[PDB]
Structure 1
Amino acid sequence: IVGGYTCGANTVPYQVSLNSGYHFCGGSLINSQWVVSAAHCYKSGIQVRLGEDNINVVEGNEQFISASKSIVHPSYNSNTLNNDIMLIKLKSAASLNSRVASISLPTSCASAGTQCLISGWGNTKSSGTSYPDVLKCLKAPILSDSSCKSAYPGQITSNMFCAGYLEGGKDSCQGDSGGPVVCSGKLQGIVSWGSGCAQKNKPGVYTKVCNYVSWIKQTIASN
């Protein structure tokens, strides 16, 4: 997250870290045994880390649980990035408390202008490299489909949305993929891609979760 602020310990209880010997992607807890992330975060040997704040130091509220299944959307296209969503089943159910909780799926899509909260342990610099120890947060608005398409001609599908600021300086970045975009207490997006990070006229692109609600519910129930 570039241009954000320190969230505060366990203030985003649905945020998880996907670890393969190091943090490589984020995710969101949707129930005691399931996490939603980006399809491009698929890797073998994933360990899901819940209740994290400082990802480099054991603080006492963590739960480390291995993934038992990773289900990538059957229509994920690795070239166009369309349908960039994946579901991860935990080998054992997590213990839900105040520091570890699920986030609700949306009942309807969010419109341009809605303010959302984006979080992650990704790079905090637009030029250069600086990975934080603690979770970073950013408040950013959802942008109109028109503006999103003008920023990325011929690359935006109906399953994506842009969020951020056209002046740049505030955005999600490498290490934030798979993480949540929460608006009015509902999970509306997943950190996906963009042209660099925090660049002028190039806001971040996110997977539009509202289009996958039925798929998510049925898939979780049949696995």
Structure 2
Amino acid sequence: IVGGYTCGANTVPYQVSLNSGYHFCGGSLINSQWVVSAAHCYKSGIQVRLGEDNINVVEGNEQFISASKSIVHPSYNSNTLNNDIMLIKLKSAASLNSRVASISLPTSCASAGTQCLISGWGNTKSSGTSYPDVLKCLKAPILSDSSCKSAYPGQITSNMFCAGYLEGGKDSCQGDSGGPVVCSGKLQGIVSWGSGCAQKNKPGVYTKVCNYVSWIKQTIASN
């Protein structure tokens, strides 16, 4: 997260870290046994880490639970990142508490101009590399689809939306991948792609979660 701030410990209690010996992606807890992330975060041997603030220090509210299954969206295309969403099931139900909490799926999509919260353990530099070890936050509005499409002609689908700031300086970044965009109490976006981080006229691109709520609800009910 570039241009953001320290959230504070467990203030984003639906935020998860995906770990396979190291943090490699974010995710969102949507109920005691299931996580949503980006399909580009798929890999085998994932351990879900809940209740995290400093990801390099055991502070006392963590839950580490191995994934039992992963389900990438059936229409995921890795080249275009269309349908960049996956579901991960926990080997055992998480113990839900104030620091480990699920985030509601939308009932309908969010509008351009709605303010959201984006969070993650990703790079904080727009030039160069620096990884934070505590969770970083960023409040960012959803941008018009046309500004989105003008930034990335022919690369935006109906399953993507842009958020952030066209002037640059504030954006998500590598390592934030699969992490949440929460607007009005609902998970509306997943950190998916962009060009560089916090560059002028290159806003962040997010998976459009409202399009996938029926798929999510059907898939968890059958798995």
TM-score w.r.t. the length of structure 2 is 1.00
Q: CA deviation at 1:79?
A: 0.8
1:211 CA displacement:
0.2
- CA apart distance, 1:86: 0.1
* Alpha-carbon distance between aligned partners in 1 of 2:48 and 2:125, rounded to the nearest angstrom: 25
Residue deviations 1:38-76, cap 9 Å, x none? 000001100000000000000000000000000000000
Counterparts of 1:186 and 1:72, CA distance in 2? 21
**2:166 maps to what in 1?**
166
> Where does residue 124 of structure 1 map in the other structure?
124
**Alignment-derived partner of residue 101 in structure 2:** 101
- How far off is 1:11 after superposition? 0.2
Tell me the CA shift for residue 26 of structure 1. Answer: 0.2
The CA RMSD measured in Å over matched residues stands at: 0.3
SS at match of 1:127: coil
In structure 1, how many angstroms separate the alpha carbons of the residues matched to 2:152 and 2:222? 36
Per-residue deviation, 1:165:
0.2
Q: CA offset at residue 174 of structure 1?
A: 0.5
Residue 20 of structure 1: how far off its partner (Å): 0.7
How many pairs were matched up? 223
Name the CA distance, whole Å, in 1 between partners of 2:153 and 2:11: 37
The superposition leaves residues 126-183 of structure 1 with CA deviations (integer Å, 9 ceiling, x where unpaired) of 1011000100000000001111000000000000000000000000000000000000
Post-superposition Cα deviations, 1:95-119, rounded to whole Å, max 9, x if no partner, equal 0000000000000100100000000
Q: Which runs of 4+ in 1 moved over 6 A?
A: none
Q: Distance in 2 between matches of 1:80 and 1:40?
A: 11
After TM superposition, the structure 1 = structure 2 runs for residues 1-223 of structure 1, keeping only pairs within 5 Å, are: 1-223=1-223
Unaligned segments of structure 1, at least 5 residues: none
Cα distance between partner residues in 1 of 2:205 and 2:61: 32
CA distance in 2, matches of 1:130, 1:168: 18
Structure 2 Cα separation of the partners of residues 138 and 130 of structure 1: 17
Once the two structures are TM-superposed, the CA of residue 21 in structure 1 deviates from its matched residue by: 0.4
**Displacement of 1:25 after TM fit?**
0.2
Cα distance in 2 for residues equivalent to 1:20 and 1:196: 25
Percent identical among aligned pairs is 100
CA distance in 2, matches of 1:129, 1:177: 16
